[PDB]
From a paper:
Bdellovibrio bacteriovorus is a bacterium that preys upon a wide range of other Gram-negative bacteria, entering their periplasm and consuming them from within.
To address the potential for domain-based diversification, we crystallized the tip of Bd1334 (which shares 75% identity with Bd2133 in the fibre region but then diversifies), from S818 and S914 onwards, diffracting to 2.6 Å and 1.4 Å resolution, respectively. Tip trimers are mediated by edge-to-edge contacts, burying 6,900 Å2 per monomer. There are no structural homologues for Bd1334 in the PDB, and sequence homologues are limited, with sequence conservation patterns being non-informative.
Numbering used by the authors:
A (entry chain A): 827 to 1151
B (entry chain B): 831 to 837, 842 to 1151
C (entry chain C): 823 to 837, 843 to 1151
The structure:
Amino acid sequence: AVNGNLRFYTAAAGTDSERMRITGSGLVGIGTPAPAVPLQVATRVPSSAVHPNRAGIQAVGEGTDVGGRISALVSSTIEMATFSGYQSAGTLAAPTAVTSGQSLTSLTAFAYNGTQYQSGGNASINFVATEAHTASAGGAKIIFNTTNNGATGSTEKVVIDQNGNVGVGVGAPTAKMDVNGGIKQPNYGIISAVRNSGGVTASMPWTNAYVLAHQGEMHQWVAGGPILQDSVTGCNAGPDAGVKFDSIATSWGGPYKVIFHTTGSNGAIHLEWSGWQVSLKNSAGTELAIGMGQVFATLHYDPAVSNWRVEHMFGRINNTNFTCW
Amino acid sequence: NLRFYTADSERMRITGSGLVGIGTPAPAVPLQVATRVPSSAVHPNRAGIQAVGEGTDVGGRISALVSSTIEMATFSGYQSAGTLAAPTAVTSGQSLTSLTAFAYNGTQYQSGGNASINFVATEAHTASAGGAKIIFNTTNNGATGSTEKVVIDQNGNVGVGVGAPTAKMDVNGGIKQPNYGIISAVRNSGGVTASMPWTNAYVLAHQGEMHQWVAGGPILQDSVTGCNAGPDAGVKFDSIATSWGGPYKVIFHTTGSNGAIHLEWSGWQVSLKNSAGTELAIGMGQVFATLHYDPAVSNWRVEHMFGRINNTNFTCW
Amino acid sequence: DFATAVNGNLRFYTASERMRITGSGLVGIGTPAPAVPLQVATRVPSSAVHPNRAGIQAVGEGTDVGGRISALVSSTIEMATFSGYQSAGTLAAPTAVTSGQSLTSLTAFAYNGTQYQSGGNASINFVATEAHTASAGGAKIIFNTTNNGATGSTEKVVIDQNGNVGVGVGAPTAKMDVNGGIKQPNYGIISAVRNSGGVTASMPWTNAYVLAHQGEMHQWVAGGPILQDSVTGCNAGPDAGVKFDSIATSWGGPYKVIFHTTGSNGAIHLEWSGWQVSLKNSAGTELAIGMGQVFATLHYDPAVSNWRVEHMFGRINNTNFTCW
């Protein structure tokens, strides 16, 4: 067709108003007389706009259709599909540096409530400036806001600060993991490792491979006391040599604190537990004391015995101390 | 079909089927933009499609709208290796899609972005495997390049300051929780008194949660039914509030009808007292106790506890 | 140059309308009534194939940068946004969303030489936690990833409406509901000995660091610590000049160190249990050797230009010790 500019106007007699333009170079501008990208939409959208009409470009879908989706496609080993968010202060003609606390980009989800959409969004992942930007500083952070049930406004729940510190329910996390609440791990039940003349038995919630692939992990939880004993090799000597830390399963239980370690060829674990009710027994099986029991033990998977066994443990039944290596 | 040519390159096309192509003579979606944007492009002109806003306007926003119980609004990111004509499977470690934020600093934008959420391939993809991971990058104050701070790996393991998290929660630093003050649960002839930072309902709704912090020692005693048996029946772990304090370790549990807690504390100074109230020892104190909200007494009570004050052990059930 | 004008709407038909430039200045593709500067509504059926399952799509190749979609804003008030709108029913008649229904999603698709992964390879989704009304608009954020050797993204993390974050948990009851292990850095072995020969300490942290990381707990596995202060700190008590002489062994033990302060300097509460530890008096004679456990409160003392033990107590085998 044309050999240069191609502009579209509306109500020209009433008031000169350009709408779209196909430049000679091949760029398309909607609301902009000078597009800077293949397709630049600039028609002014005032604050008066109502949801879901508060945007420049919009795809739409319905029922089982898949048209209400926006995409970026790249077939390259070097580049990547991107959703770029550019932010600056001042104005487009004269862009100025962003200030500290200035929001840069946001991914907001709006939901209809039969009447309208939620002002401010129902859930937002935002990028915010952590400091006034300069040619020497471009600090930024990421925040995650969601709306509590029965509420109508998204609140900041998590933050990945410029320093890398993650804060849950914390605005300025000073810790690498600053939590404003409780920490919950899985309930791994009760542990058992008995090695006696009668045989070898063990109840371990993990497997040799798992522990070997999870070195340095701590697990804390609440459950009945453990039953531990090795009157033959691992727990063979010491002041109290063949003792059995015979825990009684109770509703009160106690807190297990187990961290993973290794022998260099097999999985090992450091276990700690305190609670009710525990009875200390000797190799013969006679009860020495019964009641509150506390214990620290170091168990490891022994392939020679095809099961887990205690290498050394020490603790206290009531006011009596026992050590067993 | 309707083509829009310039002098003699075709720029736009409205096909008979109703698809629109900008830079593509064969669009595959309602509106496909393909005009070549070379690497030479500078910010903020490095993109195929771009919305723009100004001041108080809301035009600089890109949206996807869906009215359906089945489908959902999506921002789809497709990535492949090779070329468009001959696309091939992605490689291990290859980036798939990214959500990047650029910020002007009065002269330019930060090359690489100031903060980005990226999706990366964890393995060479095939018909048998499509593993992927999510990374979160941010720029530190005084820096000019976004660095990977967090990662949700293909296995679900979250890594904070860790590239290959082997733990379900692999943190490369300290873990901090709220300071819950000092706890007290005394049941005496003088009365029933207790200072608990939580409420029965709260503990019942937070089972299995661990809380650690530093504060002055606790004051615990039950000299009537629970603790008044065993080696040291009436016993008071009379902790003195000191600057050094000690580390509390409290995990939530239950009786089946009310909240219970397992408490641990060590530090200085502590005074062991008997039911009569005479001091048996003073100094370093350690204790493990199991308290629980007893409605019959309308307050928290100690079910059973045992510890060591200085080098003397004490027990109470 | 060149241009064309119209007094009002301008429709394009290929039969039947495919595009339209309204009098107000809006452009609609597949919609006879656009509501934004550029509104695309051409119906895309479920039959569509990847990567053609979308209304609008940018494309890039090799070293080019056109496969990017962007939002630009130059304002102190507004910010670049990627708005995702979701409603029930239909576009003409939108209705409130249901509980648990997904609202918006950012999914990444990857080619496997034959096709793209149905459902996406990794997705950040926003989901409704309750039926919406004028009184409630509860929502949550989910993070889905695909395991190596798998072909479907699974929900790995969730930031619920209540702020509770879950790793491998659907309904996090804890602000940090983890369905697995928690691992921290291995800070080695700690040492703080103050004797007639002098004062020495092996601390993996700095006074400044500890002062700037108050209330943080660190747990790990390593050999036992070597602690003693026979001069000022642990100079009194039942066991006055004790040295908790740990022997470095493969079995080691679990350290539990939490940060505190004196009000002017960094302090720490340390706990350690394990094998093999030797109890020694100020003179240096071994009282016992074997299983050792200890609790200690150390702090950086500037008078000594190093870390020292203020008070410590524990047990070696069955014999108990305390010092302050």
